[PDB]
Scaffold this active site. Structure first.
Site, PDB file in Angstrom:
ATOM      1  N   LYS A  79      35.026  23.826   7.571  1.00  0.00           N
ATOM      2  CA  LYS A  79      34.533  25.165   8.952  1.00  0.00           C
ATOM      3  C   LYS A  79      35.178  26.764   8.625  1.00  0.00           C
ATOM      4  CE  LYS A  79      34.403  24.091  13.615  1.00  0.00           C
ATOM      5  NZ  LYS A  79      32.757  24.530  13.733  1.00  0.00           N
ATOM      6  N   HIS A  97      26.187  17.364  15.265  1.00  0.00           N
ATOM      7  CA  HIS A  97      27.744  17.885  15.668  1.00  0.00           C
ATOM      8  C   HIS A  97      28.583  16.777  15.663  1.00  0.00           C
ATOM      9  CE1 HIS A  97      29.116  20.275  18.397  1.00  0.00           C
ATOM     10  NE2 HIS A  97      29.030  21.406  17.625  1.00  0.00           N
TER      11      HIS A  97
END
Lengths: 419, 419
Positions: free
Chosen positions: B189, B316
């Site tokens: 991330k 996701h």
């Protein structure tokens, strides 16, 4: 729920001399009936083409399905792909577009997939529509599938439908079919007479049947120039103009210059065709057909894809029996995007069938979704035996509209960009 | 199999201070657990977001489902659409793209659809994967979802994971998660530190873990220019670059100038986005997510659509529990085109769950498809009660990463085209 055995039965049944761009239908139409039987004796039905090369692939695939589970559709698909291997099965008429590896696999797979869904529905005590999200409509509207036709096959008895070779004859045929079945949409098979004569028939249908959507289907018999002239002449008259001209390119050029949407079951017939179709926009309407798009579930996926891109759905038909009609009906009933009347050849088969009579009926032009579990039909084994015996001696092994027409007019060739 | 009642339970559970483009995760993550009960007492589970506006819609829809059949997914979808009416539910972070009417309906519907499939599987004695065509893989690979993070929430106990604020810290975090779960793919991330520092971390991961596919996800924190410079710098290092820059246009411009495919869960998040995506090609990889694409079946349809157009699929994740993990796993196992490792936040929840512990395990980075019928999980009602009590007093009602970050750095704003 493992498959124990898969019975494969070719059948032949009578068909009138229906004219089209490729010639004329032969006196026998062929199909292959498939019956899947589980270890515990639950049966499922599928129905597919009867052409010899296809029949051979269906037999080979069938022999390799025992031991697979009826829910394992992905695995069954891979097994069919393994069996088909390098084979690409082509047809002689071309009225459902080009052949390819995926379309060949999908054609072979679909007979088994429908039978497996029939079994899953029986196991669950639910109609096949419930395996596809539940019916969104109680009945599926169908069109009146009109054809120019001779009074009978040369050398054989004339049929009860009469000849239809001009606007009067086509209107009379419409009155007959609509009177019997209640169809609320009309399709005319064209590419047979010069376009101006077919336009005349369409206009006559419009005058005789105000309010009913009309379609015209020349199966790519016209040039781009002719297609545009006809589309413009029919402004405000057609629900859609189906396959006026051959190819994605030619269709896209016509579509840009005519006032009604174009439809196809020729230039978009397998998923690999869709990206080019989205880019060029040859069509506003896709006629889906589970018999070559790979079964009910794959067809439902394609319907979602089309709706996403603004392409509406109708449904293409080939001469077929009640297993195919049940499958068509469950698919259309449970698929929100199939919103146009579906095509069917049903009237032309004049009651011939291999399932028991009470399950599928037309009421006001539509087939109510059967209530029983699975497809809601029951195989009539005697009727299957009658049609299999007909196959054995009918003298036809592969559909050949053009060769049959050539036996009468040696100079004839399939009309493709002809007028 | 009519729905008798639908129980809706908001829950909260602990989450570490995971940093992202929108700020930092709050100490509690919210979810809504749904349990559908049929007239005969068969239960199904679903799991969705816990944000207040969403929770309110899920309660309203739930109250209007009794009397509908669990196979009637199209009808249940229309009922949810009726309830949602004109409401469009927006979120405060934007990390799953824009809000819309369809996405709002799909978000509300998905909790019920998953529960209905759980029930259908139980009725059939089959895993949900069998309702989707059967598993094509025995286990579903997941990625290690790495985050930069503080050692703990300010004012609260530090967690067992440690801080990660530089390449060494990220590599250590990777060793920890990979040691525990066996992940064979790694995602970082980003959008937290200047891009050159995040590129450094990616390179450190490549050196520490040769052979493992790597992804970097800045959640649209970069300009087009920066994205291109970073993509080029990471040539041959990334499986894909996920959402480097905001918007279809900017993504398409980046994609044309970097050597690896781009992925998204921001600019393509509902079906209406797909025609523009096919035209501009902002992505080579779509992260599907049943929680906002409208359930497992709709997600499967979208997977077919993507494969047709050459767009590959990943998945996701948002912070989630075992009902979502079971649903993710059945969907990925039974969908041929989901071929990239799926994302999951599972490690960060450190064993918190509302289902019994033995059904979902990670073995060599992958979750084997559960064997039981339905989703293969069992609600632990005490655990549900514990998490519901936490929701009641946790003091959070809507996810707000940015507001939480602003409480520490008042000048902070979500990074969007920032570096």
């Amino acid at each position: 729920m493992l498959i124990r055995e898969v019975r494969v039965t070719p059948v032949a049944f009578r068909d009138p001399p229906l004219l089209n761009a490729a010639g004329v239908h032969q006196p026998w139409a062929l199909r292959t009936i498939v019956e899947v039987v589980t270890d515990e004796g639950i049966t499922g039905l599928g129905e597919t083409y009867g052409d010899l090369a296809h029949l051979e692939q269906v037999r080979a695939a069938a022999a390799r399905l025992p031991g697979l589970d009826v829910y394992a559709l992905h695995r069954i698909y891979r097994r069919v792909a393994d069996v088909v291997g390098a084979n690409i099965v082509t047809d002689m008429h071309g009225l459902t577009g080009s052949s390819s590896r995926v379309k060949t696999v999908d054609r072979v797979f679909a007979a088994f997939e429908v039978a497996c869904l029939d079994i899953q529905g029986k196991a669950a005590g639910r109609p096949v529509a419930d395996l596809l999200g539940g019916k969104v409509r109680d009945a599926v509207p169908y069109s009146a599938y009109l054809f120019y036709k001779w009074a009978g096959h040369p050398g054989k008895p004339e049929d009860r439908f009469g000849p239809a070779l001009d606007p009067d004859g086509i209107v009379a045929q419409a009155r007959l079919l609509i009177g019997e079945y209640g169809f609320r949409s009309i399709k005319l098979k064209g590419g047979v007479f010069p376009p101006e004569q077919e336009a005349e028939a369409i206009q006559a249908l419009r005058d005789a049947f105000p309010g009913l959507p009309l379609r015209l289907d020349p199966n790519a018999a016209w040039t781009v120039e002719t297609s545009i002239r006809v589309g413009r002449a029919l402004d405000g008259v057609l629900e859609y103009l189906e396959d006026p001209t051959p190819g994605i390119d030619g269709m896209a050029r016509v579509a840009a210059e005519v006032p009604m949407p174009l439809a196809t079951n020729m230039c978009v017939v397998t998923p690999e065709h869709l990206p080019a179709a989205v880019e060029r926009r040859p069509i506003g309407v896709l006629l889906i057909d589970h018999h070559y798009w790979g079964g009910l579930v794959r067809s439902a996926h394609i319907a979602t894809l089309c709706a996403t891109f603004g392409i509406e759905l109708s449904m293409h038909s080939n001469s077929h029996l009640g297993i195919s009609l049940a499958a068509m009906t469950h698919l259309a009933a449970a698929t929100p995007a199939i919103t146009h009347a579906c095509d069917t050849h049903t009237p032309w088969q004049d009651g011939q069938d291999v399932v028991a009579p009470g399950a599928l009926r037309f009421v006001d032009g539509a087939v109510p979704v059967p209530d029983g579990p699975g497809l809601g039909v029951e195989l009539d084994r005697d009727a299957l035996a009658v049609m299999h015996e007909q196959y054995e001696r009918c003298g036809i092994r592969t559909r050949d509209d053009e060769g049959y027409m050539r036996s009468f007019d040696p100079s004839f060739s399939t009309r493709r960009g002809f007028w």
